[model samples]
Target chain A: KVSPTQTPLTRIISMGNNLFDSGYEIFASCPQNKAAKVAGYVYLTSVGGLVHGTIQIKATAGYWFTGGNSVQESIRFGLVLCPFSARDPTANLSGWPAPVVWSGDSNTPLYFAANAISYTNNRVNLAVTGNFYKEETELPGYTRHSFCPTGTTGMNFTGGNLYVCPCTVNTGATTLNAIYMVFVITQSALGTNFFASNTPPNTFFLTPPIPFTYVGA
Target chain B: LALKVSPTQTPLTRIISMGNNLFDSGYEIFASCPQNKAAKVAGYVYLTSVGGLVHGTIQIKATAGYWFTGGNSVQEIRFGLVLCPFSARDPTANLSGWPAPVVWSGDSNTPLYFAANAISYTNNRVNLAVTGNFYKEETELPGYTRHSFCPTGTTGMNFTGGNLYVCPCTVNTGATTLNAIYMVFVITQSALGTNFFASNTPPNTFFLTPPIPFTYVGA
Candidate 1:
């Protein structure tokens, strides 16, 4: 059995490039012996109206990953951390074991390709995995420091959409090795002319890659 | 098996009044948990009434723990929050996204969803006054109109002219009024714990945490 504990809400911040649909990344890591349990929410400050954009989050052991873009706005991602629990190793165990804390070990290093030789000796378990589609308006709201002077409503969910998915990597022991995930706007949605009124054609955006294992799946 | 709370226990609700006859200024009040035992789940907010007149206002910003009532002049306001024991059981089906920390004790079975102001901003990172007229004159509205921030499928239950509104996330649709910034948590009946219900009440209770002096806090 696993005894779960939660940490107070934590925040990670990053400044935007401000160059219209530019990309930015930030990282959040849990303290020793803990893993990210939940991604509370993402916030964008100093933007006028909700813009067309995307966000991607991934986790490995004690670290959290972020990849996304907003037009001329700073971003913040909040998270809740879960403390790891150790199970009784002396008892004879059967089937899958409970999830424990994950840490960097020297067993395997450079893990990028799908066909890594390391997989022959060490395999991973998929904890929980699925994707969901969110209309533009379904997302939590962001702060708009400016509004349309012409009173034009910014981009709505009409054609834009967000696709989110998550996958966990474990080495049979259920340690929750990595929470590889993806959050982003589809390429077709970004190609729309809806945002052209505010910015030029070259200012369009793209989402970060969906992790390798589940990339085409 | 589904998650359940103790039927014998009442959902703890905390209501805080930010004083009457206060000056004009912005405020950020956190209707906190009972220390480590609980976590905020659902609730409502409204300006306090004086001489039978209440100010119409918007919660300039709201998150899981605090509500930053945007600035307009100083005014009195009150908030009612529902809390649940903080548990390791995840209320949301997906642990990767934003999930309200508390479990539902009502009678809805659908998966719970946490919906708030569509857009969120970093605290003290943006200036509301410089934003536009929306933030500049929200708290100055006349009469007593409270925006209900319930999830998509549920309507808020409130008296015709009452001060408190509670959302139980039933399979109805009426609570669609949006505020500039607000927080509303929803979980289906199947996820409810053993909390009780009293004549349309879901074993949920309302409370007040004594009024405090008003002060301006920028967001």
Candidate 2:
């Protein structure tokens, strides 16, 4: 229960691992505020303590838009950004999945809807090194980053793996219809701040997504 | 944090599927600081849902660190604490949102090391749900803390529940307290190869991930 005077952003930047009350909380008030701000549940991708990858949001003059989907696992590090010094939004849309999470995939998300990935964001980097772990062994590959801020993405059971696909081919394999399936936040350049955990084989989730089909079910 | 190595070798107590933002929400999450500080954290995550920490100052030492590489070897580079994005609702539930990458932020040279992914822990319905009065100044020592970048725009990313990835080792000091991202706390009770905790997070177990700085007026 705080004041409703919204303060939009001017210099665009992303906040890492944030949280919110609901979609109406930001949408209902700050859409037209036009200050070029970034917010979402963005978490930096990692490979042995080194930080890479990010999620972004589009801060147009009108409404803030988040579009698309992201890999799920490594999922919740994408927590809410509890305004450091600002007042908490009133519309505490409690009870899980506080709306306005996923923005939209060019569908022009309403002030009421939110998603994980976004269509475009001007102030962040997109190229990422994909992280893969087979438990017994692990490999960190390259990934093309794309998603939303105040945005998000996911995979189930375990943190997901990122695959960088060319614009063209793929054999009949158990995969999404995507080129690169993915997913930021903010901070200075990850200079020396980058560090990774040593999840030795058998110690980490030693399982991969079994080949499967996806017909929206 | 202070590390006093005594002639002690104790087993860690693990708890699972417990505290969460939606349910039990009083565990303060501290940020990262420098190595060998005088502040002591309340608890640490040994693995998914697995916790290893005791009350008061840390007074123990071990002969193992963690795996720096998957299927790799363990070294003396050790740290403490971890946060798994595993839904607290059920340790076996799949994650509902984009999970954070695995990273080790703490850095303290030690002689102890662990086998790859080899976190010694008990089973769960297991894992440790810790709530304690930790040293706030532990993180306030100001090694480095940034408050400029903000995650604005979207929302609805569920952290489910998390655990402490605890691996303690030091040279006359407490283990370094590093701050990485998130992952699922893989429960041991479940059969091997049984990941995935929630489906689309199964509703009601999710949250919006935007740190709101504004407050509302009237309806």
Candidate 3:
């Protein structure tokens, strides 16, 4: 979420796709010193003449993107960016600190299942950003994606419950300067499409977790 | 009462289309910043991908710019760059870092394709954090077919051995001339995270099995 008082720290590079071809791979990036943080996409598509389509969001260090099967598409890809300085404190931690490594000396830690993750130190925080695809149904098969605001709780989707769980980091004695955190997000939403009965109960981290890679203090 | 704009904050500035012009019928459009400044690509103009697919990629070097490829029949694609002043690159700020964004400069006419090196190692290493088809536009750019892939990745383009390849524009034809410029990001050992892939299963899934921070091991 952005505030009027907060100067815009992100850039949006968007494109509209009305091309008859359904398959597309789009890469949206921030200017120099910025990194891909969040992404938003909408498609006015349909199967046999109705609004329908499948979309997914994925990220790598250099970029954030959406690709694959877009149908009778009238869609726009919007990528939200954050400063690289806000991401990594490599050069001068004292001068350009964002997230300080709090615990978990090693990058790999014991994984736990949960919707929300927090630390006792509380100095460091965790939040989710970006949108990704979740599921598909039958005959104009119902498809949905998951997403949350920057630093917000719960992964929201169309039909299922936005399952809110918790994650516990195995505390270690030696606090490392920094360790990366990758998440396997899950949510439970109610069904919306006609094949509701056949749909699964919950959706796993099926979509790309573009901003799921977290840096903690 | 209506709110007013503040003067103290630096307003967003945009630089209009700097890439292809002259109605030469080219698909690639490129843009970069002057020395010391950086570019935030605002997207493209004029051209439309009506018949073909549109693909693009960003380069981080001593100068920053974006290269786009699409339908060649439409009007020339005009690339836009949002100017970020070098002075605005504050190290202490959460919005920018030290040694602003940059890219490697190639030949004056075709830097996007001819460039063989990156501005620095930090810039070269910074690009490794990502991968996928979304980042696959560099290979499709003009003159890219003449050279092999870069040493690192798409961000760091290079010139390979000369084979039985022919000239890019034409065999000997002369008419419209096309020239270009280039720029390129670097990295420092910090708390940067690498590109991650989530597991398909839920309930007790391990995100990163080895747990790692994307460190500047060498670069």
Candidate 4:
């Protein structure tokens, strides 16, 4: 019997790119603009209590590349979030236990995809496993402001328009694996006013993945 | 348009001894107005269908004032006239629709007359109005007029006149001597009731005779 007041435990697992030899990389192209080249092996590890039922994994873009005189594009590969249990130990790789959920790049110009992978070794993995394209627009001035509006605006504009882009990667092409999940990304650029800022810094960081599992009693 | 005294004859006679036996003796008189015979003496009469005589006589008299006072005297008196039942209250029975019954005295007083102006009396069916103090303007058939009679406080003392002129005992004042004037009596025996009648009177009997009648002058 499930208690009415009982609250479920939520755990987040962030396996650095070093574990899979894949992750995001930042390259400083010029003093005005900095380009972030994301290339690494990314893997996820489960912590706390193992999810018995369905779990949702979400990945999204944190910030825009703000270095260099020209606009530096932030790109992402396909990622996935999945539910894994120690007892079942089944990873849906052939889209069986789909990446329960996913979140894509939120920054307007960035585009990304997510996929779910289930391994036989009792390990369920969410992979950011694809290539992306990047381009930039010229910056206006060298003055540093807290926030400034990027050229991207309206649904027609392409870059720097999105606040957060989150995508769900499910098991089947049509069905969503994880029904309920919330994805939150924290970054240093959050406090800094990007709308008013001129020549904003080019460093962006992604918080560790926060995974919330849903156990249907 | 037409005032018709029904039965064409009275079937019973009732006599009440008052003052000298002269006041009590029943007499039928037909008196016409000096000016208009149609505007003769008018009042109500007490009737009884099952009383002393099998066929009663209707008396016609002409009078003026409240009780035939002032310049009003008996110009003509006719007796031994019988009037049939001109109006009756039986739903299944057919009778002419006479005026509503009106009594002179409020308490235990005999009905004086029933007034049905411009009434249509057809197929032995008549419409009569029963008046009471509590009656609204256009209400139909309140309780019997006698049940609502009150003497001291004036609760149900007043009576209403119906549509047709049905005087049970009509008295025509002969004060006006116009030859074109005459009196009329229209009685419908169907609207008789012991409650509205004298205590010992019979049922289903009524009488009406106008105090005066109108004579047409040649144009």
Candidate 5:
């Protein structure tokens, strides 16, 4: 039997994922620096509630920032998830996961994923590629304890896809403090509900058909 | 608007141009070297499964070694064709009917169709006032980034060979940059058929979707 989740056979063969299926595009813009650190960020808070589901992400430096002087001096982009408890997953946010530097090969799409999710608590830090984990000494989990000094930080959409600003690391630092720590996106939605609710009846700053509230994933 | 019954005519933007005789010194080298100038061509990376016949072909040469120069000056001019991709219900040609084979130039990395028509040896420069949508196409260069263009209006294209080609960079008969172009065909080895596939099929090649007509550099 066919349900809403499954698109028709003929149609599904040639299609891209959508927000309806918990699809999100994570963009980042990092710059090479003397300190050699990655900074900047863009967060997405739910106007409604926690995001829950299985997810997949993909990208290539060709479509955005790529290469550098030394091998370590190359530009790379990744994602950081903030639960309602971590910081702001909604509205315009700033700091780590900085602005996007979109100038690379966008010919092919990629695949990255996140399974079930649920939370509402203290702010958290950034996590790339995998689920966030709780660290013993860190402040909360996703809180913006530090930030990138020069890079973009925002979100937008195009060609039927959501995009996070390119993130960077130019904040005259060695190791990204709040960064390089154990992940904790998994630390979100674990605690009791936080005070901030969806700015709207049930959603964040998003467009039509988007999840006003990420149920899970 | 429609396809010619044979490759002798084209729908819209041909690969280069078809007037080497009408406008002398009017031949260009139309090569699609996305990654390198060395990879001659493997044909279009098609979108739909119209994998039966005509793969596309582009040939631009007046002096061998793949280079074109006028007045002894080398120019990396901005000149290329856009494709409307979408074909009529029945297309008459593949993408090989536009260019006329001539001795390609030296070192092979240029297009003289970029030079001035009335441009004698002393003042050989790409002529924009001569009828090119040159500067008006910057905003739409990365066709994928700026989804603006579809070769529209009357498809006034002529070909002598049975292949669909974009000839010497000299201005062709058509003047619009809309969806008035035709870039794909389904038969390469067979006698020209009256039909090809749809233009919007994915896995499409050329610069981008609807392939932006003229490409630019050093601007």
Candidate 6:
């Protein structure tokens, strides 16, 4: 019973789907003058690379204004892992056979099942990407993009507990071209081998295709 | 006249002649009358003009003393001077003598008698016991001549042991001017009878010229 993940006795408060919406909105508008045109959704995925558990993915839309000096911006998103019991099953991903447990435009609540296998041997991972756009009024412009992924290894104990990994996506214009696009990724619960090998040394990463563009407009 | 044979003693007339000029110049003359036989003796002396004009006269008055035959004989008497020098220094040129002669006993020559045999006298002097008070006045008579019995030092009136003295003379005339000087004779109480002589005769007098009024000249 003396587990490192064991926290003090306290109430477990859920932020529900509002946390996701806030992060999504923030990530979507990361580029200059660009507005997210879509409301992104989050879901649990099972890719079985690090932790034998569920992963949450969030997505949103944003845009950047064209015809201005070059500027860069980013949005951040986070997720926490917590303990659960069979009496409180994990929230189902949308359109999946399991029951939908958590979803909101501003917040999301995730639940867990006691009967579920623990990913104590593997680590949980998180990743984020953003869609970048210049002003539609400007001539044809390509989307600029930037991304970051963060993760933790060997943290699968639970009891409404949380393990948070945050990510940021950035975008801006380059000299040669103008661009517009969304930065998206699917989070996965992976095996120990994959978790050990793929786990980022730091909590945050700067992915390639860094939201940058040339004014082809 | 049948002579009644009754033993009665007749006291002889005692012609006792006390030596003439026996006492010094300033002695007193005292006289007393015999009992039941009051006698009056009188006389006069004409002093001749010796040399210079007699500047002043010296008059001697007769005084009475107690008659003591053994214990003390007494008698009630009144002595009078019907004639005597009225003034010691009479300005009138009655120059028969420098000091006009005087009748020592002035009873019109009724033998010029006196009580007893002769007059008993004592010395009579000025008795100059000076007793007085003085004050300095802001101003003096223009020509007032101040007289001090004892004048000394810086010209002004000063005093020493009942003696009238003066201050040292100075250039300023007013500096030494004595406004007033009062001379008094303090007769001994026992000599009160002698003071009667001064009152009976003209009082002894002196003179001081009125000081010339001093006037300031120039600024």
Most accurate candidate by DockQ: 3
- List per-prediction Cα lDDT, in the order shown: 0.20, 0.19, 0.20, 0.21, 0.21, 0.20
TM-score of chain A of 5: 0.23
Candidate 4: how many backbone clashes? 129
Better of 1 and 3 by DockQ: 3
DockQ of 2: 0.01
- Could you give candidate 6's per-residue lDDT for residues A1-217 as a string of tens digits? 2221221111122212433444332223323434322222223311101111222333311121223221111232222222221122221111122224432221112222111111111111112232323221111111112234332343221111111211111121111110112343323333122113243323222222121211000
lDDT of 2 by residue, B17-71 (tens): 1112121232233222123321111122222111122111001111111111222
What is each candidate's DockQ, to 2 decimals?
A: 0.01, 0.01, 0.02, 0.00, 0.01, 0.00
Q: Write the per-residue lDDT of candidate 2 for residues A1-217, one digit (tens) a residue.
A: 1111221111111232243322212211111221112233332221111112233222221232222111211211111221111122221111122223232222111111111121111012212221111210110111212222221111122223322211111121211111122212222232111112221211111112211110000
DockQ, prediction 5: 0.01
In terms of lDDT, the poorest run of 10 residues in model 1 chain B is: B210-219
The residue ranges of model 5 lying beyond 4 angstroms of the native Cα positions read: A1-217, B1-65, B70-77, B82-219
**What lDDT is obtained when candidate 4 is compared to the true structure?**
0.21
Model 2, which residues run further than 4 Å from truth? A1-52, A62-217, B1-219
lDDT of 4 by residue, B35-152 (tens): 2222222222332212121111122322221112222121221111112122222211111111233222222222211111112212212222121111111122121111000011
- List iRMS for all predictions: 21.7, 20.0, 20.9, 55.4, 25.1, 83.0
What's the C-alpha lDDT at position B11 in model 3? 33
lDDT of 1 by residue, A80-184 (tens): 111111222211011112222122222111111121211111222232222121221222221111111111123221222221111223322333222122122
Name the candidate that leads on TM-score: 5
